Amino acid sequence: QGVNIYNISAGTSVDLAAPVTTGDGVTFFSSALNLNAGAGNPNNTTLNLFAENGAYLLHIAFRLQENVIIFNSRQPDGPWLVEQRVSDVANQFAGIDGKAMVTVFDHGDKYQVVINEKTVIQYTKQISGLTSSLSYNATEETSIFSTVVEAVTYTGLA
Amino acid sequence: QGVNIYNISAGTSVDLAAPVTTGDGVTFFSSALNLNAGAGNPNNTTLNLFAENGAYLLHIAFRLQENVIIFNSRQPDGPWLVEQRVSDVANQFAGIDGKAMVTVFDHGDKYQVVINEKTVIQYTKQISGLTSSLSYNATEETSIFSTVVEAVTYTGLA
């Protein structure tokens, strides 16, 4: 029922005018696809969905040197929970280059993560709740995506 | 659910691998915004949704000179049905400049057209059915959007 555009600058987070919940979706658009970037520290780029208390509902980290993608969750003060992994970074972004889009579907009990047209993981939730803020962490010198990512949100749906 | 990406060059159309149906959505992304494009005849740009038969489920036409976004429909060999209007084009895109996006949600009885964040019209369908074809018609000289517009679909939702 509603569309919201957010211009997330690398290293910052943002509050949503419309909360993301079951039936909703968010898509992080990047205007570049740096697959020859430096080495992550240890991450090159991260995309996250936070709960109102600050807990990471979905933490997605890309690591080129380690050539793997990380998927986890953690309460605002708690420890990183059970790690989920997927090898072959460059392979996910296949078919499309010069840019890339990452989508997260809030299926209620699971977060479907889609890179371009390819579903990379049907991530079972370790923490529930609606998402009120997103973030994009990376440094200009080593992020796989553009310095400014455009996360567009589609809410109201259900 | 699934995500589909289609690059559409001005004047062409494309078959969807996944049809847009009730509860689904499409977002055409333009890398440019030209509000001084020139004289359309009478259209500067049009975005469309067709069904197998070829019917115009929804015909979105942008017109700078006439300063109006027209919305209509029509059967295969039929005449245009009842036109709907939204005056002042530049005003709908107010908010972002170097680019723009147009989303279309299929809510069964109505098509909800949203330009960027602004919902421009609650178009009650004059013809129902599934969308098998997306289309972007314009010339490389008078289009308000970039020469190639990227259509992204969100399906399987409901």
Coordinates of C-alpha atoms in Angstrom, one line a residue:
Chain A
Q1 CA 0.0 0.0 0.0
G2 CA 3.0 2.3 0.4
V3 CA 6.5 3.0 -1.0
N4 CA 9.4 4.6 0.9
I5 CA 12.8 5.6 -0.5
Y6 CA 15.8 5.8 1.8
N7 CA 19.3 7.0 0.8
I8 CA 21.5 5.1 3.2
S9 CA 25.1 6.4 3.3
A10 CA 27.8 3.9 4.1
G11 CA 28.4 3.8 7.8
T12 CA 25.0 5.1 8.9
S13 CA 21.6 3.7 9.7
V14 CA 18.1 5.1 9.2
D15 CA 14.7 5.0 10.8
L16 CA 11.7 3.9 8.8
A17 CA 8.6 6.0 8.4
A18 CA 6.7 2.7 7.8
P19 CA 7.7 -0.4 9.7
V20 CA 8.5 -3.5 7.8
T21 CA 6.6 -6.6 8.9
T22 CA 5.2 -9.9 7.7
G23 CA 4.3 -9.8 4.0
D24 CA 6.6 -6.8 3.5
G25 CA 9.8 -6.4 1.7
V26 CA 12.9 -4.2 1.5
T27 CA 15.4 -3.9 -1.3
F28 CA 18.9 -2.4 -1.1
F29 CA 19.9 -1.0 -4.4
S30 CA 23.6 -0.4 -5.2
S31 CA 24.9 1.5 -8.3
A32 CA 28.1 -0.5 -8.4
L33 CA 29.5 -4.0 -7.9
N34 CA 33.1 -3.9 -6.7
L35 CA 34.3 -7.4 -6.9
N36 CA 38.0 -6.4 -6.9
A37 CA 37.8 -4.4 -3.7
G38 CA 40.3 -4.7 -0.9
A39 CA 39.9 -7.0 2.0
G40 CA 37.1 -6.8 4.6
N41 CA 37.9 -6.0 8.2
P42 CA 36.7 -8.7 8.1
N43 CA 33.5 -7.5 6.3
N44 CA 33.5 -5.6 3.1
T45 CA 29.8 -4.6 3.4
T46 CA 26.9 -5.4 5.7
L47 CA 23.2 -4.8 5.3
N48 CA 21.0 -5.0 8.4
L49 CA 17.4 -4.9 9.6
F50 CA 16.9 -3.8 13.2
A51 CA 14.0 -4.3 15.7
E52 CA 12.9 -1.2 17.7
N53 CA 15.1 -2.2 20.7
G54 CA 18.1 -2.4 18.4
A55 CA 18.4 -6.1 18.0
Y56 CA 19.8 -7.4 14.7
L57 CA 16.8 -9.2 13.1
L58 CA 18.9 -9.9 10.1
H59 CA 22.6 -9.2 9.7
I60 CA 24.0 -9.9 6.2
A61 CA 27.8 -9.6 5.8
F62 CA 29.8 -10.0 2.6
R63 CA 33.5 -11.1 2.8
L64 CA 35.5 -11.3 -0.5
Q65 CA 38.8 -12.7 0.8
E66 CA 36.9 -15.3 2.8
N67 CA 34.6 -15.5 -0.2
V68 CA 31.4 -16.1 1.8
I69 CA 28.2 -14.3 2.9
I70 CA 27.2 -14.2 6.6
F71 CA 23.7 -14.3 7.9
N72 CA 23.0 -13.8 11.7
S73 CA 21.0 -12.1 14.4
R74 CA 21.7 -10.7 17.9
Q75 CA 19.8 -8.9 20.7
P76 CA 21.0 -5.3 21.3
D77 CA 23.2 -6.4 24.2
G78 CA 23.5 -10.1 23.3
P79 CA 26.1 -12.3 21.4
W80 CA 26.0 -13.2 17.8
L81 CA 23.6 -16.1 17.6
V82 CA 23.8 -19.1 15.2
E83 CA 25.7 -18.2 12.1
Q84 CA 24.4 -19.1 8.6
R85 CA 26.8 -19.2 5.6
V86 CA 26.8 -19.2 1.8
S87 CA 30.0 -19.6 -0.3
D88 CA 30.8 -18.0 -3.6
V89 CA 30.2 -14.3 -3.3
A90 CA 30.8 -13.2 -7.0
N91 CA 28.6 -16.1 -8.1
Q92 CA 25.5 -14.7 -6.4
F93 CA 25.9 -11.4 -8.2
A94 CA 26.2 -13.3 -11.5
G95 CA 24.3 -12.2 -14.6
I96 CA 24.3 -8.6 -13.5
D97 CA 27.3 -6.3 -13.1
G98 CA 28.0 -2.6 -12.7
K99 CA 25.4 -2.6 -9.9
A100 CA 23.3 -4.9 -7.7
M101 CA 20.1 -5.2 -5.7
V102 CA 19.5 -7.2 -2.5
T103 CA 15.9 -7.9 -1.3
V104 CA 14.6 -9.2 2.0
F105 CA 11.1 -10.7 2.2
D106 CA 9.6 -10.8 5.7
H107 CA 7.8 -14.1 5.5
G108 CA 7.0 -13.9 9.2
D109 CA 8.9 -16.9 10.4
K110 CA 11.7 -16.6 7.8
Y111 CA 13.5 -13.9 5.9
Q112 CA 13.9 -14.7 2.3
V113 CA 17.1 -13.0 1.0
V114 CA 17.2 -12.5 -2.8
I115 CA 20.2 -11.1 -4.6
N116 CA 19.1 -10.0 -8.0
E117 CA 16.8 -12.8 -9.2
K118 CA 18.6 -15.4 -7.2
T119 CA 17.4 -16.6 -3.8
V120 CA 20.5 -17.0 -1.6
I121 CA 18.9 -18.2 1.6
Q122 CA 15.6 -19.0 3.3
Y123 CA 16.8 -17.7 6.7
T124 CA 14.8 -19.0 9.7
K125 CA 14.5 -16.2 12.3
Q126 CA 16.5 -16.2 15.5
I127 CA 14.6 -13.0 16.6
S128 CA 11.1 -11.9 15.7
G129 CA 9.3 -8.6 15.3
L130 CA 8.8 -5.7 12.9
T131 CA 11.8 -3.9 11.4
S132 CA 12.0 -0.1 12.2
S133 CA 15.5 0.7 11.0
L134 CA 18.0 -0.4 8.4
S135 CA 21.7 0.2 8.1
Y136 CA 24.6 -0.2 5.6
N137 CA 28.1 -0.5 7.0
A138 CA 31.2 -0.2 4.9
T139 CA 34.1 2.1 4.2
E140 CA 34.5 3.9 0.9
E141 CA 37.8 2.1 0.3
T142 CA 36.5 -1.5 0.5
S143 CA 32.7 -1.9 0.1
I144 CA 31.4 -4.1 -2.7
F145 CA 28.5 -1.7 -3.2
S146 CA 28.2 2.0 -4.0
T147 CA 29.0 4.5 -1.2
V148 CA 25.3 5.4 -1.0
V149 CA 22.7 2.6 -1.1
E150 CA 19.0 3.2 -1.9
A151 CA 16.8 0.9 0.2
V152 CA 13.3 1.1 -1.0
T153 CA 10.5 -0.4 1.2
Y154 CA 7.2 -1.9 0.2
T155 CA 4.8 -2.1 3.2
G156 CA 1.1 -2.3 3.9
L157 CA 0.8 -5.3 1.5
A158 CA -1.0 -7.8 3.8
Chain B
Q1 CA 8.2 -15.2 -3.6
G2 CA 10.5 -14.2 -6.4
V3 CA 12.3 -11.2 -7.9
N4 CA 12.5 -10.6 -11.7
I5 CA 14.6 -7.9 -13.5
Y6 CA 14.0 -6.8 -17.0
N7 CA 15.9 -4.1 -18.9
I8 CA 13.5 -2.4 -21.3
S9 CA 14.8 -0.1 -24.1
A10 CA 12.5 2.7 -25.2
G11 CA 9.9 1.4 -27.7
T12 CA 10.1 -2.3 -26.8
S13 CA 8.2 -4.7 -24.5
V14 CA 9.0 -7.9 -22.6
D15 CA 7.4 -11.1 -21.6
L16 CA 7.4 -11.8 -17.8
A17 CA 8.8 -15.1 -16.6
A18 CA 6.4 -14.6 -13.7
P19 CA 3.0 -13.0 -14.3
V20 CA 1.9 -10.0 -12.1
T21 CA -1.3 -10.9 -10.3
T22 CA -3.3 -9.7 -7.3
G23 CA -1.0 -8.9 -4.4
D24 CA 2.0 -8.5 -6.7
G25 CA 4.0 -5.4 -7.8
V26 CA 6.2 -3.9 -10.5
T27 CA 8.6 -0.9 -10.2
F28 CA 10.1 0.7 -13.3
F29 CA 13.3 2.4 -12.6
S30 CA 14.7 5.2 -14.7
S31 CA 18.3 6.4 -14.3
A32 CA 17.3 9.9 -15.6
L33 CA 14.5 12.5 -15.3
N34 CA 14.0 14.9 -18.2
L35 CA 11.2 17.3 -17.4
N36 CA 12.3 19.5 -20.3
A37 CA 12.4 16.6 -22.8
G38 CA 10.3 18.3 -25.4
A39 CA 7.1 17.7 -27.3
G40 CA 5.7 14.2 -27.1
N41 CA 3.1 13.3 -29.7
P42 CA 1.2 13.4 -27.5
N43 CA 3.1 11.0 -25.2
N44 CA 6.7 11.7 -24.0
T45 CA 6.7 8.4 -22.2
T46 CA 4.4 5.5 -21.4
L47 CA 4.5 2.5 -19.1
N48 CA 2.1 -0.4 -19.7
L49 CA 0.8 -3.7 -18.4
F50 CA -0.6 -6.2 -20.9
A51 CA -2.4 -9.6 -20.7
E52 CA -1.9 -12.5 -23.0
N53 CA -4.6 -11.4 -25.5
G54 CA -2.7 -8.1 -25.7
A55 CA -5.1 -5.9 -23.8
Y56 CA -3.9 -2.8 -22.1
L57 CA -4.6 -3.7 -18.5
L58 CA -3.2 -0.3 -17.6
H59 CA -1.9 2.4 -19.9
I60 CA 0.3 5.1 -18.1
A61 CA 1.1 8.0 -20.4
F62 CA 3.2 11.0 -19.4
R63 CA 2.8 14.3 -21.3
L64 CA 4.9 17.4 -20.6
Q65 CA 3.2 19.8 -23.1
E66 CA -0.3 18.7 -22.0
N67 CA 1.2 18.6 -18.5
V68 CA -0.7 15.5 -17.5
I69 CA -0.3 11.8 -16.6
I70 CA -3.1 9.9 -18.4
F71 CA -4.3 6.5 -17.2
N72 CA -6.4 4.2 -19.3
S73 CA -7.1 0.6 -20.6
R74 CA -8.3 -1.1 -23.7
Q75 CA -9.0 -4.5 -25.2
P76 CA -7.1 -6.0 -28.1
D77 CA -8.8 -4.5 -31.1
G78 CA -11.0 -2.2 -29.0
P79 CA -11.2 1.6 -28.5
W80 CA -9.8 3.3 -25.4
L81 CA -12.0 3.1 -22.4
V82 CA -12.6 5.7 -19.7
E83 CA -9.5 7.9 -19.2
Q84 CA -8.3 9.0 -15.7
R85 CA -6.2 12.1 -15.2
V86 CA -3.4 13.5 -13.0
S87 CA -2.4 17.0 -13.8
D88 CA 1.1 18.4 -13.4
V89 CA 3.8 15.9 -14.2
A90 CA 6.8 17.6 -12.5
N91 CA 4.9 17.8 -9.3
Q92 CA 4.6 14.0 -9.0
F93 CA 8.3 13.5 -9.3
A94 CA 9.1 16.3 -6.8
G95 CA 11.5 14.9 -4.3
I96 CA 14.3 13.3 -6.3
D97 CA 15.9 14.6 -9.4
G98 CA 18.6 12.7 -11.3
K99 CA 16.3 9.6 -11.4
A100 CA 12.8 8.3 -10.6
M101 CA 10.8 5.2 -10.1
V102 CA 7.2 4.2 -10.8
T103 CA 5.5 1.3 -8.9
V104 CA 2.3 -0.5 -9.7
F105 CA 0.6 -2.7 -7.1
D106 CA -2.0 -5.2 -8.3
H107 CA -4.8 -5.1 -5.7
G108 CA -7.4 -7.2 -7.6
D109 CA -9.9 -4.4 -8.2
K110 CA -7.5 -1.5 -8.5
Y111 CA -4.0 -0.6 -9.7
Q112 CA -2.2 1.6 -7.2
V113 CA 0.3 3.8 -9.1
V114 CA 3.0 5.3 -6.9
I115 CA 5.6 7.7 -8.2
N116 CA 8.6 7.5 -5.9
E117 CA 6.8 7.8 -2.6
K118 CA 3.7 9.6 -3.8
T119 CA 0.6 7.5 -4.5
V120 CA -0.7 9.2 -7.6
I121 CA -3.9 7.3 -8.4
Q122 CA -6.1 4.5 -7.2
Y123 CA -7.0 3.2 -10.6
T124 CA -10.1 1.0 -10.5
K125 CA -9.5 -1.6 -13.3
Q126 CA -11.6 -1.4 -16.5
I127 CA -10.2 -4.8 -17.4
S128 CA -8.8 -7.5 -15.1
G129 CA -6.5 -10.4 -15.6
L130 CA -2.8 -11.2 -15.2
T131 CA 0.1 -9.2 -16.6
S132 CA 2.3 -11.1 -19.0
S133 CA 3.9 -8.1 -20.6
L134 CA 5.5 -4.9 -19.3
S135 CA 6.3 -2.1 -21.8
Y136 CA 8.1 1.2 -22.0
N137 CA 7.4 3.3 -25.2
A138 CA 9.2 6.5 -26.0
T139 CA 11.8 7.9 -28.4
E140 CA 15.5 8.5 -27.5
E141 CA 14.7 12.2 -27.9
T142 CA 11.6 13.0 -25.9
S143 CA 11.4 10.5 -23.1
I144 CA 11.2 11.8 -19.5
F145 CA 13.0 8.6 -18.4
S146 CA 16.4 7.2 -19.3
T147 CA 16.8 5.3 -22.7
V148 CA 16.6 2.0 -20.8
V149 CA 14.2 1.6 -17.9
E150 CA 14.6 -1.3 -15.5
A151 CA 11.4 -3.1 -14.5
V152 CA 11.5 -5.1 -11.3
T153 CA 8.7 -7.5 -10.3
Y154 CA 7.7 -8.9 -7.0
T155 CA 5.5 -12.0 -7.4
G156 CA 4.2 -15.1 -5.6
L157 CA 3.4 -12.9 -2.6
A158 CA -0.3 -13.6 -1.9

